[PDB]
Amino acid sequence: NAKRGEIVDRNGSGLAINKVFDEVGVVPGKLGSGAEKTANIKAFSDKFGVSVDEINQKLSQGWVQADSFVPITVAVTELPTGAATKDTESRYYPLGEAAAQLIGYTGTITAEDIEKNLSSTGVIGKTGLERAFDKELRGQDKKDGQTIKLTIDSGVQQQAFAIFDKRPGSAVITDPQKGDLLATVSSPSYDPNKMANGISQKEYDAYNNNKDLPFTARFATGYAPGSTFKTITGAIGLDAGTLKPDEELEINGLKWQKDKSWGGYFATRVKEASPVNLRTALVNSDNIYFAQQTLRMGEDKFRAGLNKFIFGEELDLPIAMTPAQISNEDKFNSEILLADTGYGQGQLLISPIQQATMYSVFQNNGTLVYPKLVLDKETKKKDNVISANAANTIATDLLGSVEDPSGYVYNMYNPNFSLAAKTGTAEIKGKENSFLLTLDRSNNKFLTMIMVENSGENGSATDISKPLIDYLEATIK
Ligand SMILES: [Cl-]
Ligand SMILES: [Cl-]
Ligand SMILES: [Cl-]
C-alpha cells in the first residue's frame, strides 16, 4: 500500500509530507465494554489530555478492527487499560496554518469516498491541493505517489501570513513576469495538522463558529477590487485617447455627481486638491477624477478596455475560482454604476489571484501574465492587454505613492529600491475593505496584492504590510 507523495515548495522544502510519530492510542478489543469501557476511555482522556468525544470519534471510524491500534495523540510510564504506544506515520504540514487553505489536508476514507472511486485504511485529500492533486499524490496500492513541486516560497508565505495577526484578509505575491505564485495567504486560518490527525469537537466548532470563517480560501474568493482598480481605469483611458495625462481637471470639494439625476449618490475623495492631473489623481487616490474620466470615455470605450483583461475566463490553475465579472449584466444601465466601476466598486467581482493577474500588465509593458502554481508549468501570457506607454506611464506615476513624503505608502520608502504602489478601498453594504498593490520596479521580480477586510475595525493593508515589503526587497529583490 503506497506512500503518499509530497507537496514541496519551489526550493524543495516540505509543504505536505509524511512523518512518523510515537503515538499513544487504544486497542478496541482490550478496552472492554459497557461502563467498564467508558471508564477506560475516561482514564485515557484524563491522563493524555484528549477529549472523550475525540477518542470515541477515532474509535468509531470504519477501518477500526478489534485488534487495531487506534492512534489518539502523540506520546508515558503508566498505561491505562486498553492503552498502548506505537510508531505510526502521519501526514504533516510544516507551515501549519500559514498555508492551510492552499495546501488543505487529508482524511480517512469514508463510505461515500469508497462509493465514487481504495482501501479503508488509506487517506484522501479533503480540501485544497491535497484534494486537487490527490490522484497524483496517492499512487497505486507498488507505486508511491509523485512529488509535486510548487512555485510557493515558504519564507514569503510565512512572512505574508504573519502580518495579519488574525485580521481577516489575504495576500497574493507573484513573480509578475513569469506568473509564479510565491505566496497565497488567507487569514484567519486553522491548524491543518489537527484537521488531518486529531481535533476535538470543541476545537472544530470554534473554527466553524468563527464569524471570520478561517476555512475560506480568501485568495480565491471574488471581491470588488476597490479603488486600486483606478490603475486599470487610467490605463484604459490613456489608450482610448480620452484621458490626457497632463490635462489639469478642476475639481472642488470632496464629493461630485454628474447632475441631480444621481440623487443622493456621489463620487467622493479624501483630500481637497485642484487642479488634478493623472499623476496627482493616482497618488491622491482621487475617485472623482476617475469617475469623471470614466464618464468621459463612456461605456463602450471603458468595456472595450476591460474586455481585454481576463473577465469571464476560467483559469488553468488548480485552485477553484469563479471567473471575474465586470457587472451582473452585459450593460451597466446606470451612469452611477458606470462611474462606480471606474474606481473599483459597483458589481465588479475579482479574486485576489485574478487581481494580481490583471495588475501584471504594469510590469510587463502591457502584457498580462497568467498565474501558475506548479513550478515546471510553462509560462502563459495575453499580449497587448494595454499599451506599453499606458503600462509604463501608470507604473511611473505609482512610484509617487512610495516616494512622495505625502504619499500613502511613504512609510515604506527605501532610497535604494524602486517600489511603485497603489492603496485602495472598497465600501460594501456599511463596511470597508482596504487594499495595497506594490510593484517591484527595480527588477520586476515581485508584485504584491494585499487586502484587509473590515478595515474600519482592522486597519489598512498599508498599516501591516511593511515587513512583507521589506522582506521581498531583500529576498526576491
Ligand atoms: Cl489566524
Ligand atoms: Cl499551475
Ligand atoms: Cl497610494
Dist. CA 169–CA 107, nearest whole Å:
27
Dist. CA 126–CA 142, nearest whole Å:
24
Dist. CA 211–CA 2, nearest whole Å:
39
Residue written as grid cell 470614466: 294
Q: What is the resolution of this structure in A?
A: 1.8
DSSP 3-state of 111: helix
The answer to whether 372 touches 249, Cβ cutoff 8 Å, is no
Residue written as grid cell 441631480: 260
Cis peptide before 275 (omega within 30 of 0): yes
Neighbours of 244 (CB within 10 A): 13
Ligand nearest 397 Cα, by number? 3
* Catalytic (active site) residue 170: no
DSSP 3-state of 342: helix
Neighbours of 62 (CB within 10 A): 12
CA 221–ligand 3 middle distance (angstroms): 24
Residue 300 phi/psi, 5-degree rounding, is -65, -50
Dist. CA 223–CA 347, nearest whole Å:
9
List beta partners, residue 92: 17
Q: Which residues hold their Cβ within 5 A of ligand 1, which is an ion?
A: 166, 188-189
Elucidated via: X-ray
The residues, ordered by sequence, that sit 6+ positions from 289 with a Cβ below 8 Å of its Cβ are 249, 251, 269, 276, 278, 281
Domains of the chain, start order:
7-149 (3.30.1390.30), 173-182+216-475 (3.40.710.10)
Q: Which amino acid is at 267?
A: A
Compute, in degrees rounded to 10, the torsion defined by CA atoms 209, 214, 219, 222: 0
Instruction: Render 29-83 in DSSP notation, one character per residue.
Output: GGS-SHHHHHHHHHHHHHHHT--HHHHHHHHTSTT--TT--EEEEE---SPPTTE
CA 213–ligand 3 middle distance (angstroms): 29
Query: Which one from 90, 187, 189, 227 is the annotated catalytic residue?
Result: 227
CA 473–ligand 2 middle distance (angstroms): 25
Run of H or E residues at 434: strand 431-440
Neighbours of 242 (CB within 10 A): 17
List beta partners, residue 16: 7
CA 437–ligand 3 middle distance (angstroms): 8
Dist. CA 5–CA 18, nearest whole Å:
8
